[PDB]
Amino acid sequence: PHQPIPPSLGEKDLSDPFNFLFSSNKITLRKLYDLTKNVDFDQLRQNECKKNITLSKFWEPEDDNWERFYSNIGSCSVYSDDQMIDNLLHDLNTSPIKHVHIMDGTQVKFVFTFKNDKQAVFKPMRFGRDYESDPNHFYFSDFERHHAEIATFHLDRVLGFRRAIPTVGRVLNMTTELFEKAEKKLKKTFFFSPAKNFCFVSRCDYYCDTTHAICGLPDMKEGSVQVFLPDESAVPRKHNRSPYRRTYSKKNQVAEWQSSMNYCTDKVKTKRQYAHGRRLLDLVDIHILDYLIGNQDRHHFESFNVFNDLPSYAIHLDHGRAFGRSDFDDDDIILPLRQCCILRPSTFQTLMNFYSTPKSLTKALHESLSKDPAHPILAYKHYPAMERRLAKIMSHILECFESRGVAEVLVAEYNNPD
Ligand SMILES: *[C@@H]1O[C@H](CO)[C@@H](O[C@@H]2O[C@H](CO)[C@@H](O[C@@H]3O[C@H](CO)[C@@H](O)[C@H](O)[C@@H]3O)[C@H](O)[C@H]2NC(C)=O)[C@H](O)[C@H]1NC(C)=O
Numbered sequence: 432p433h434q435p436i437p438p439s440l441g442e443k444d445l446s447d448p449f450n451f452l453f454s455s456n457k458i459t460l461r462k463l464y465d466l467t468k469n470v471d472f473d474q475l476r477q478n479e480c481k482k483n484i485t486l487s488k489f490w491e492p493e494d495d496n497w498e499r500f501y502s503n504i505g506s507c508s509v510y511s512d513d514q515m516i517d518n519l520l521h522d523l524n525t526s527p528i529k530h531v532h533i534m535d536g537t538q539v540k541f542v543f544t545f546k547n548d549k550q551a552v553f554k555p556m557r558f559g560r561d562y563e564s565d566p567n568h569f570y571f572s573d574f575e576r577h578h579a580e581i582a583t584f585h586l587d588r589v590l591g592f593r594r595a596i597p598t599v600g601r602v603l604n605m606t607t608e609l610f611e612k613a614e615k616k617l618k619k620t621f622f623f624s625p626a627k628n629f630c631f632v633s634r635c636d637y638y639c640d641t642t643h644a645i646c647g648l649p650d651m652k653e654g655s656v657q658v659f660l661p662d663e664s665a666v667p668r669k670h671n672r673s674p675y676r677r678t679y680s681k682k683n684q685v686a687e688w689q690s691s692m693n694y695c696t697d698k699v700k701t702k703r704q705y706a707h708g709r710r711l712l713d714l715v716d717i718h719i720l721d722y723l724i725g726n727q728d729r730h731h732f733e734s735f736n737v738f739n740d741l742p743s744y745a746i747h748l749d750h751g752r753a754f755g756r757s758d759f760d761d762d763d764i765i766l767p768l769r770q771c772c773i774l775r776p777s778t779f780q781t782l783m784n785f786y787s788t789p790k791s792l793t794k795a796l797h798e799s800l801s802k803d804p805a806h807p808i809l810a811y812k813h814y815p816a817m818e819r820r821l822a823k824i825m826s827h828i829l830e831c832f833e834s835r836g837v838a839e840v841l842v843a844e845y846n847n848p849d
Pocket residue numbers: 480483484503505507508510511512513514
C-alpha cells in the first residue's frame with residue numbers, strides 16, 4: 432500500500448537503531464576546546480533571557496492541561512515543565528473527540544474539538560516512515576509528513592529550546608472519531624476506494640483531491656495531534672517575513688543570500704529588527720534546528736506578542752516538511768550560521784555536549800520519541816544523518832570562532848556597533 436498502516440500496528444522492528452558507525456573528529460573537537468577553555472559560560476548564559484516570566488504572573492484557570500499549558504507560556508520559552516507537557520500529550524492522544532472541522536484554509540489538516548471544548552490541530556498520515564522526498568521536488572512541492580511534526584517537537588526539547596508546540600501521535604478510528612464527528616462540508620468528501628479502504632478528500636489548496644485522498648487500511652488512520660495556540664484575542668501573535676526566505680520559483684532558484692556571502696553583514700545585521708536583541712540569535716537557533724531536520728520551508732516566523740516591553744521569540748512551528756531526505760544535507764539551511772557567525776552560548780554548549788559524545792543526540796531523541804504512542808516516529812536511517820549534520824555544524828562554528836573570534840560569536844545578546 433502507498434498509504435500504509437500505522438507502524439505501531441505493524442510488526443515491531445527488533446533492529447538496533449544505532450548499529451551505525453560514526454566517530455568524532457578529534458582535531459576539530461580539540462580546536463573548539465582550546466578556543467573556549469577560558470569562557471565562563473555560566474555567567475554568559477544568565478543574559479540570554481532578560482526577564483523570565485510566565486503568562487499567568489504577567490496577567491496578575493488550570494482546569495485542564497491545555498489551560499495549564501497556556502498559563503506557563505514564558506517570555507523566553509513556550510514551556511518549562513516536561514511532566515506537565517507529557518500530561519498534555521497524553522490528553523491529546525486519549526481525549527474523546529467531539530467535533531472535526533476543516534482548518535484554515537495549505538495542505539489537509541483538521542481542527543479537533545475535544546469533550547473539554549479544548550482544541551488541537553490534526554494532520555493525517557500519508558506515506559510510510561521509509562518514504563523519502565522526490566529529488567526533483569522543490570520545498571514547495573513537498574507533501575507534509577505528520578511524523579515530522581512530532582519528531583521535531585521532541586528534538587526541540589532535547590536541544591533544550593522548548594519553543595516548539597506540543598505534538599503527539601494518535602491512531603484514529605476514521606468511522607467513529609473522524610467521519611461521524613465531522614462537519615457537514617467535510618463529511619461529504621468521504622468515500623470508499625476500489626480496495627474498500629475508507630478515504631476522505633476534504634478541502635484545501637494543495638491537492639485535496641480524489642487522486643491524493645487520505646485512505647485507511649481500511650478504517651484506521653494515524654496522524655499528528657498538536658495543541659492549539661491560545662486564542663489570538665487573549666494572546667496576540669506576530670507574523671514576520673524571514674530575511675532568509677527562499678525564492679519559491681523554479682526559474683530563478685537562487686535568492687541573494689544563497690549567492691552573496693556577506694548577505695548577513697550587509698542586509699540582515701544592519702536592519703533595525705536584527706541590529707539589537709535576540710531575533711538574530713533566534714534565527715540562528717531555528718536554522719540549526721531546520722538544518723538538523725532538513726527543513727527548507729522556513730519562509731516566515733511566528734511569535735507571541737503579549738509580553739509588554741520584553742523581547743519576543745520565534746515559535747518553532749510548521750515542521751511538516753522536515754525529515755524528507757536521509758541521504759542529503761542542505762547546507763543552504765545552515766547558511767545563517769556561516770554568514771552571521773553569532774551563536775547563543777547555551778546553544779553552543781548543547782551542541783558541544785552532544786557532539787563531544789557521538790550518537791548521544793539521536794539516542795536522547797530516540798528515547799524521547801519512544802514515549803509517543805505512535806512510535807517509531809522516524810525511520811532509523813535519519814539518525815546517522817542527524818549525527819552527520821551535527822558534525823558539519825560544529826565545523827561551521829569552528830570557522831566562525833577562528834575568523835571572528837570567540838568573544839564575537841558567543842553572545843547572549845547581539846548589538847551592532849554600526
Ligand atoms: C524560567 O523560569 C521558570 C520558572 O521556574 C523555569 O522553570 C523550571 O525549570 C526547571 C529546570 O528545567 C524545571 O525542573 C524540572 O522539573 C522536572 C519535572 O519535575 C524534573 O524531572 C527535572 O529534574 C527538573 O527538576 C521546573 O519544572 C521548571 N518549572 C516550571 C514551573 O516549569 C525555567 O527553567 C526558566 N528558564 C526558561 C528558559 O524558561
